Write a protein that binds this ligand. Structure first.
Ligand SMILES: OC[C@H]1O[C@H](O[C@H]2[C@H](O)[C@@H](O)[C@H](OCCCC3CCCCC3)O[C@@H]2CO)[C@H](O)[C@@H](O)[C@@H]1O
Ligand SMILES: OC[C@H]1O[C@H](O[C@H]2[C@H](O)[C@@H](O)[C@H](OCCCC3CCCCC3)O[C@@H]2CO)[C@H](O)[C@@H](O)[C@@H]1O
Ligand SMILES: O=S(=O)(O)CCN1CCN(CCS(=O)(=O)O)CC1
Ligand SMILES: O=S(=O)(O)CCN1CCN(CCS(=O)(=O)O)CC1
Ligand SMILES: [Cl-]
Ligand SMILES: [Cl-]
Ligand code: NA
Ligand code: NA
Lengths: 220, 220
């Protein structure tokens, strides 16, 4: 394949005994281990759930450490086209990674949920709607939808979506939540929001709590 | 998959009896049937060879007919990022299409050759070097190598390459041949050229003749 394999991590539900799957998608400069930590507070409430977190296919070239799903031109000093390419390629890799994990867990699409952060959220909102089969749901923390104009045309699947954003975010503007949110609604997605009041570019306890509820319902 | 399946055509060697595979990659505005025509003069000299030609995953939006491997911003009035994305996505689709055809023919990579035209040539020079296993070879007619700077880093496989370009080409400058050619050589590819003297953006008899020789040797 031209496909790139993603290294990853896993918990907590025992290998072979998972009844649902959630995949964490980390942000620019981080790695899977970062978000996979979220498994600690979530697992007791999602007993049958397996949690997986891949590292993005490329090292963060500007950061100097950690990984990126694609470079960020204005921050990275990379070309916008090289960035757009990384994004499309990274989506295919992630698409494949998903199929692989669902196999090893022996689960079907509707038992899978995506939980992203930043750049991870952008990857989730891009890949899921373009998969053949509708997944359980998506939780996107702060939070941007690439190319909202192409959503209606390219949406094969329309899983429920919960957007969670901090109203003091200096990195990704809080206004983006409404942008993503309106476009998902108009494209026919069942769309929910949660506002982390006072919160910047980060995941607050209240946001995490609402995500958990959303996940416990949508998940088997 | 997010993967897109490509409709295609085939000849001439009998289904199940192919000993080698060549895939034609058409240009912006055309379709597979266009280049697949080349099978008529080539088949008698490549008796065991099967010829296949996919249609590019998208309709040519600006043309109005035929297909594109990706839009061409300055000609298409599409964004450069949307174009770069189409390119990376189209490469993954083509990557997959290849694996599929090699299966149905029951052949291995080293028995596959790519023959491109224009945009098709750009797709070939991008995908082949990024496949795990080295193919028989590539013939690229006029002819541009995307992102030559990334070749050395991203070249997993280095099949032989023959570049064929017309020295009167108003569409893709003849200078591009040397650009692609030097970069392939420096990246360690075995690289050949053929100049279609007097020829514009098109495939001349002499170019086709040299391609045939190249193919008869490299192919099983
Ligand atoms: O483990 C350390 C704790 O803090 C992390 O916070 C960091 C997160 O590790 C990082 O990915 C982000 O940094 C963002 C900085 C990168 C920006 C976005 C991309 C462009 C460059 C700026 O900040 C959040 C703030 O909670 C996690 O969100 C939180 O779960 C974790 O428990
Ligand atoms: O079947 C018609 C004959 O002519 C075609 O020629 C056309 C080809 O069908 C087309 O793809 C290209 O047009 C290029 C025009 C498109 C340009 C490049 C992309 C940007 C837009 C301008 O011209 C060549 C000239 O031989 C084929 O090359 C030749 O094999 C075929 O037998
Ligand atoms: O894990 S830690 O808590 O140490 C911080 C995690 N991390 C910090 C650095 N960035 C981007 C750097 S840059 O985009 O500003 O160059 C990725 C996220
Ligand atoms: O098959 S035919 O012999 O009829 C011509 C094949 N064909 C002509 C049109 N172009 C691009 C049109 S545009 O890019 O200039 O809009 C695709 C190639
Ligand atoms: Cl909203
Ligand atoms: Cl040369
Ligand atoms: Na971003
Ligand atoms: Na071109």
């Amino acid at each position: 394949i031209m496909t790139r394999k993603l290294t990853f991590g896993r918990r907590g539900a025992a290998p072979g005994e998972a009844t649902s799957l959630v995949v964490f998608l980390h942000g620019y400069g981080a790695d899977g281990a970062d978000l996979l930590g979220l498994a600690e507070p979530l697992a007791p409430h999602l007993p049958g759930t397996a949690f997986v977190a891949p590292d993005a296919p490329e090292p963060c070239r500007a950061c100097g450490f950690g990984f990126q799903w694609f470079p960020i031109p204005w921050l990275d000093g990379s070309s916008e086209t090289a960035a757009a390419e990384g994004m499309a390629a990274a989506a295919r890799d992630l698409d494949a990674f998903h199929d692989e994990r669902l196999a090893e867990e022996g689960l079907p699409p509707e038992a899978l949920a995506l939980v992203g952060f930043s750049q991870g959220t952008m990857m989730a909102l891009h890949v899921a709607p373009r998969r053949a089969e509708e997944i359980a749901g998506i939780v996107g923390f702060s939070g941007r939808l690439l190319a909202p104009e192409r959503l209606a045309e390219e949406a094969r699947s329309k899983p429920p979506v919960l957007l969670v954003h901090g109203d003091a975010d200096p990195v990704v503007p809080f206004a983006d939540m409404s942008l993503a949110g309106e476009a998902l609604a108009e494209a026919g997605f069942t769309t929910y929001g949660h506002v982390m009041k006072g919160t910047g570019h980060g995941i607050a306890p209240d946001g995490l709590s609402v995500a958990l509820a959303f996940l416990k319902e949508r998940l088997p």
